[PDB]
Design goal:
Helices cover 7% and strands 29% of the residues. The protein is mainly beta and 257 residues long. Bound molecules: zinc ion (ZN). Zinc ion binds at residues 91, 93, 116, 195. One of its GO terms (biological process) is positive regulation of dipeptide transmembrane transport. It is found in: Cytoplasm; Cell membrane.
Length: 257
């Protein structure tokens, strides 16, 4: 099955998922000088006050914090988006070392990790229908750098011991994703894809300019997770990022001057 090792990692994915070589793949390098300021772009509207987290899952490639997406409770709108996108889950990608881990890069800079808040367009009714549409998802990407601790991340860090291995889940109610946001909602946006199989070209990417800071101790706990299932040979869950893909015929737009 696909993964992040030398025999099943990103350079192999195209054999099972030929869209891996498609025209709108993610992530990409954000060349800050080439991104065009678009005064038509609206402020992002992030409405997470009624978010209902339910559960955290180690799925063997990352961990997902899952939300109740059966009502407009945690929604993204505005920015580059038409209509309303409901939060279904967030997860991270991270490195073995602080010098790598992000999927998007900024002028070729790699951050220690990247948070993806995944939302689906309510006009398609369910996530599975949304991923079949070119405007089906909006993923809000937030870079992580190592420095000060992020207090709002610690509840996530502290439950990871209970989901060490693939297939483990834990109740994870009352988690407020507002505690993972930076101060500024300035962003870049472009049309792209899921960054894991099935690599569907269904995402409007919204990447925040301002990173969040997390502590060395917080990211070190991400790196204690396992890709393997319980009672299998230990394979640390590190370097679960896809590198930058060709931009092809795309424009990256900036919300800010
Ligand atoms: Zn992701």
């Amino acid at each position: 099955h696909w993964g992040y090792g030398k025999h099943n990692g990103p350079e192999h994915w195209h054999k099972d998922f030929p869209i891996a070589k498609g025209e709108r793949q993610s992530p990409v390098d954000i060349d800050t000088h080439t991104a065009k300021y678009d005064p038509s772009l609206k402020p992002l509207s992030v409405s997470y006050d009624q978010a209902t987290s339910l559960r955290i899952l180690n799925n063997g490639h990352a961990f997902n914090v899952e939300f109740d997406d059966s009502q407009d409770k945690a929604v993204l709108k505005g920015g580059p988006l038409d209509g309303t996108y409901r939060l279904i889950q967030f997860h991270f990608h991270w490195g073995s070392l602080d010098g790598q881990g992000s999927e998007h890069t900024v002028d070729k800079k790699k951050y220690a990790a990247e948070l993806h808040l995944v939302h689906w367009n309510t006009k398609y009714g369910d996530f599975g229908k949304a991923v079949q549409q070119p405007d089906g998802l909006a993923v809000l990407g937030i870079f992580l750098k190592v420095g000060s601790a992020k207090p709002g991340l610690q509840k996530v860090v502290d439950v990871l011991d209970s989901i060490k291995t693939k297939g483990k889940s834990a109740d994870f109610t009352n988690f407020d994703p507002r505690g993972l946001l930076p101060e500024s909602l300035d962003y870049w946006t472009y049309p792209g894809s899921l960054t894991t199989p099935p690599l569907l070209e269904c995402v409007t990417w919204i990447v925040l300019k301002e990173p969040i800071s997390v502590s060395s101790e917080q990211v070190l706990k991400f790196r204690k997770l396992n890709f393997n299932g319980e009672g299998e040979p230990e394979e640390l869950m590190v370097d679960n990022w896809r590198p930058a893909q060709p931009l092809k015929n795309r424009q990256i737009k900036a919300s800010f001057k």
